[PDB]
Curated annotation (Swiss-Prot):
GO terms for molecular function: ATP binding; protein serine kinase activity; protein serine/threonine kinase activity. It comes from Zea mays (Maize). Casein kinases are operationally defined by their preferential utilization of acidic proteins such as caseins as substrates. The alpha chain contains the catalytic site. Its EC number is 2.7.11.1. GO terms for biological process: DNA damage response; regulation of cell cycle. One of its GO terms (cellular component) is cytosol. InterPro entries: CK2_alpha, Kinase-like_dom_sf, Prot_kinase_dom, Protein_kinase_ATP_BS, Ser/Thr_kinase_AS. The gene is ACK2. This is Casein kinase II subunit alpha. It is an enzyme of class 2 (transferase). It catalyses: L-seryl-[protein] + ATP = O-phospho-L-seryl-[protein] + ADP + H(+); L-threonyl-[protein] + ATP = O-phospho-L-threonyl-[protein] + ADP + H(+).
């Protein structure tokens, strides 16, 4: 398996672009940045709204929990590689505590409204608008040789006032190399693509388009997460209970993947639920034949059939959005 697009980005680049351990982090002034209020939490970090005392600009201070040095080098080189491109969170500075030497990563500030709150307020057009903004970030990082590997609504910051969107949390992101076998213990559960769940390790940028699709189905159908699995096996089972098991088996044969019998048994045999069997009175206004057709081209077991981020942006679903732009 290889990526159908952008497969050669990192090979043509000088080795210094993707050799993230070759990076010597140039360090900044911890004082420059003061914690104002707590904004977020997660496994690998705590996140604070901050102030730059030099110039009084708001900022985001992301303080990392004790972390392997190599894993911080990767997140940092990715961010430096991607700073400036469409809808990518801009790294402002990287500072450390002097005594214990724990990193804080300084970002542009976004007056985010949490998705659990913001999403039910969104018009049909806003949904289209924001998926398109995210698609810009995705096509961009994919072109630059990076897979985000953790696309979810929590990782998509949205100032709704300024219609500003930033793809954040590049902690699970990774450079793409052809025939490189990756860890499938990436992404967040409900946004894990069939490939991660079935132990297909030579995956690529397409993984992000599954996650995108999950995130998109949850928005239009108002079922979030759309795929609610309890563990990694109940995730695949929830996918199969919708996408059908017939579609799975051809996919498993294509990449010659056998399932564990514990998995096979839990998965069983299921007919496909048509996408229109998620439309109810509540979400009715966010479904259209185009929303269905676009989503159907995202959520495919086969990562090679999946729309790329650049194809996805030309979908007639986004027509009105491209027209405004
Ligand atoms: O965990 C988080 N939370 C968060 C927010 Br709320 C913003 Br505005 C920003 Br810009 C960033 Br990088 C993060 N990481």
């Amino acid at each position: 398996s290889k990526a159908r697009v952008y497969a050669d980005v990192n090979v043509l680049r000088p080795k210094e672009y993707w050799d993230y351990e070759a990076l010597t982090v140039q360090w900044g002034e911890q004082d420059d940045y003061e914690v104002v209020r707590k904004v977020g939490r997660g496994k690998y970090s705590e996140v604070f709204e901050g102030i730059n005392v030099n110039n009084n600009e708001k900022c985001i201070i992301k303080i990392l929990k004790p972390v392997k040095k190599k894993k911080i080098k990767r997140e940092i080189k990715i961010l430096q590689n991607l700073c400036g491109g469409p809808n990518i969170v801009k790294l402002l500075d990287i500072v450390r505590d002097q005594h214990s030497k724990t990193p804080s990563l300084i970002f542009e500030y976004v007056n985010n409204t949490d998705f659990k709150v913001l999403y039910p307020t969104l018009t049909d057009y806003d949904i289209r608008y924001y998926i398109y903004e995210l698609l810009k970030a995705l096509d961009y990082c994919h072109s630059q040789g990076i897979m985000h590997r953790d696309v979810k609504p929590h990782n998509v910051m949205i100032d709704h006032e300024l219609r500003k969107l930033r793809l954040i949390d590049w902690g699970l992101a990774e450079f793409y190399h052809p025939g490189k076998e990756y860890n499938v213990r990436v992404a967040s559960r409900y946004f894990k693509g069939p490939e991660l769940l079935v132990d297909l390790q030579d995956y690529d940028y397409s993984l992000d388009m599954w996650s995108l699709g999950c995130m998109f189905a949850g928005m239009i159908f108002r079922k979030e997460p759309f795929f609610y699995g309890h563990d990694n096996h109940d995730q695949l089972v929830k996918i199969a209970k919708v996408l059908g098991t017939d579609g799975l088996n051809v996919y498993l044969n294509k990449y010659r993947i056998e399932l564990d019998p514990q998995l096979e048994a839990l998965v069983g045999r299921h007919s496909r639920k048509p996408w229109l069997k998620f439309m109810n009175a509540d979400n009715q206004h966010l479904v259209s034949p185009e929303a269905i057709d676009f989503l159907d081209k995202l959520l495919r077991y086969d990562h090679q059939e999946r729309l790329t981020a650049l194809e996805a942006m030309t979908h007639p679903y986004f027509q009105q959005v491209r027209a405004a732009e």
